[PDB]
Amino acid sequence: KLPPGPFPYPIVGNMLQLGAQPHETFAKLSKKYGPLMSVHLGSLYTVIVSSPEMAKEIMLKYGTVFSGRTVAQAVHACDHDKISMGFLPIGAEWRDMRKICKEQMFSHQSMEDSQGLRKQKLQQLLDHAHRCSEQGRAIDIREAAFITTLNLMSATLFSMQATEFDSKVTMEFKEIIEGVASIVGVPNFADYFPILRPFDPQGVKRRADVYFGRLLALIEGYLNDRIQSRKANPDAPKKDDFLETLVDILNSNDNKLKTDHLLHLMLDLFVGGSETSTTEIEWIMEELVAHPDKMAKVKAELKSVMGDEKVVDESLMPRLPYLQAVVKESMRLHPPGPLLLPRKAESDQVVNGYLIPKGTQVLINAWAMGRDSTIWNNPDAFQPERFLDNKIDFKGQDYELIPFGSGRRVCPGMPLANRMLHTVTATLVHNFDWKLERPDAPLAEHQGVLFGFAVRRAVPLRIVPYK
Numbered sequence: 001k002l003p004p005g006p007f008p009y010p011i012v013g014n015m016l017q018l019g020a021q022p023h024e025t026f027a028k029l030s031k032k033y034g035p036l037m038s039v040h041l042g043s044l045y046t047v048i049v050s051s052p053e054m055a056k057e058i059m060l061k062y063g064t065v066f067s068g069r070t071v072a073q074a075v076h077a078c079d080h081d082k083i084s085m086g087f088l089p090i091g092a093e094w095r096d097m098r099k100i101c102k103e104q105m106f107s108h109q110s111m112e113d114s115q116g117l118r119k120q121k122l123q124q125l126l127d128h129a130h131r132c133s134e135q136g137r138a139i140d141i142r143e144a145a146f147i148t149t150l151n152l153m154s155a156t157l158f159s160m161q162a163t164e165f166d167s168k169v170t171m172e173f174k175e176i177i178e179g180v181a182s183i184v185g186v187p188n189f190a191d192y193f194p195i196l197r198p199f200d201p202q203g204v205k206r207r208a209d210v211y212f213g214r215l216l217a218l219i220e221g222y223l224n225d226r227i228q229s230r231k232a233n234p235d236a237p238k239k240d241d242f243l244e245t246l247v248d249i250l251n252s253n254d255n256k257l258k259t260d261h262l263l264h265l266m267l268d269l270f271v272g273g274s275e276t277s278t279t280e281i282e283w284i285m286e287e288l289v290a291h292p293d294k295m296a297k298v299k300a301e302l303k304s305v306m307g308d309e310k311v312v313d314e315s316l317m318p319r320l321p322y323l324q325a326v327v328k329e330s331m332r333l334h335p336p337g338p339l340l341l342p343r344k345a346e347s348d349q350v351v352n353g354y355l356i357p358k359g360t361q362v363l364i365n366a367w368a369m370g371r372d373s374t375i376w377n378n379p380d381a382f383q384p385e386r387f388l389d390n391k392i393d394f395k396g397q398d399y400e401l402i403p404f405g406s407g408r409r410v411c412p413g414m415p416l417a418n419r420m421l422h423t424v425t426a427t428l429v430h431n432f433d434w435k436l437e438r439p440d441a442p443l444a445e446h447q448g449v450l451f452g453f454a455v456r457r458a459v460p461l462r463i464v465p466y467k
């Protein structure tokens with residue numbers, strides 16, 4: 001009674017038929033089997049959903065049913081799978097971490113207060129960007145967008161006041177994320193073949209506990225050191241960051257959260273906003289460089305609003321209606337997560353007549369719906385003009401665009417993502433002219449796909465500022 005899919009082979013099921021870079025294969029197989037597919041990844045049953053109306057059935061109509069999360073083995077490291085807001089069933093401790101996220105830390109009231117903590121972090125990059133232009137060196141966009149992202153998240157969370165782009169604090173964080181991504185970003189057969197779960201054959205759960213213990217040790221030091229600063233100054237001026245808010249929650253003791261609940265929350269906030277922004281800023285700074293007709297419309301717009309100001313204030317978003325679309329088009333073409341984050345059917349539920357069993361990992365292919373010929377016309381072409389004078393937005397209600405998810409577990413970092421994805425892009429676009437470090441380059445590198453935590457270019461984007 002389940003959705004249609006290819007013949008499950010013994011044991012392996014449909015885990016050899018995927019080929020390399022599965023996101024496209026889960027898309028092409030949908031043209032024969034349908035929007036609701038059934039792929040037997042080993043023992044892990046999985047339903048692929050690749051159409052807006054079906055994503056509406058999954059995330060909204062039956063959303064409270066499909067509101068779980070498939071948990072990976074690396075997530076059990078340091079008991080993260082039982083503390084994190086990302087991978088907990090919708091419950092008492094999760095509702096608190098949402099109402100805390102959306103209403104206090106990610107509402108506009110806190111975004112506008114954290115506006116000044118992040119401009120300094122763009123200036124450090126813009127000054128470093130000018131460093132590579134004088135001697136005429138090339139800038140690794142991924143490297144530059146990662147360190148800037150950590151400096152951006154660390155300022156929003158901790159209010160670190162370093163004077164160096166590659167500060168000592170930031171590079172301790174950079175290794176651990178890249179170490180975690182190198183762990184989760186590769187397949188762990190314990191997830192698909194449960195008899196291997198006790199053994200942990202590839203040693204994934206262990207190696208994750210090492211880096212998780214480090215990333216949580218550095219977060220602890222930033223908590224206990226603030227408590228003493230909170231004790232020394234009783235009328236301490238409210239820091240306009242996320243950590244100060246979190247300290248002000250367990251001192252009032254209104255909600256029902258522990259201390260480890262907050263530590264692991266800052267981890268998810270830190271990790272969740274780093275490698276996503278890092279990849280999803282490499283794309284626009286490639287799309288605009290690969291299609292110079294469109295960068296020209298962005299620059300001429302930016303010069304119309306900036307004036308002589310050389311850093312983009314996140315409050316000038318409404319006056320950049322084209323950069324809003326340029327990101328929107330990058331959301332459609334190259335979504336950061338090709339299959340988003342796995343959902344789980346917490347109850348036997350029927351969708352479109354087919355039965356979806358309990359514990360069915362529902363992957364919402366956002367890559368296909370970005371290149372589905374039935375939705376966007378000429379989908380394989382970059383064109384931010386299709387979003388001009390269009391209310392289609394990635395807020396979750398336009399299932400034609402689901403890069404940030406929708407339903408009950410929508411991305412809580414959306415207001416912080418777009419203010420980042422726009423400013424750190426509009427600061428490199430408005431200030432310099434870019435050209436590929438290698439114009440005689442294989443197009444396999446351009447729009448290349450790397451399956452892992454997020455899909456990114458096959459080769460890190462390396463361009464030069466020559467103005």
Ligand code: HEM
Nearest residue numbers: 085086269272273276277336340341405406409411413417
């Ligand atoms: C920059 C682009 C980003 C993308 C494309 C992205 C993507 C996603 C997706 C697809 C989901 C799951 C949605 C669903 O299952 O329906 C999610 C959830 C989540 N994201 Fe992001 N994210 C981004 C940035 C961020 C940022 C900046 C933060 C934190 C500051 C963050 C933290 C989280 C957390 C904690 C969750 C768990 C939500 C829950 O389980 O209720 N992400 N994200």
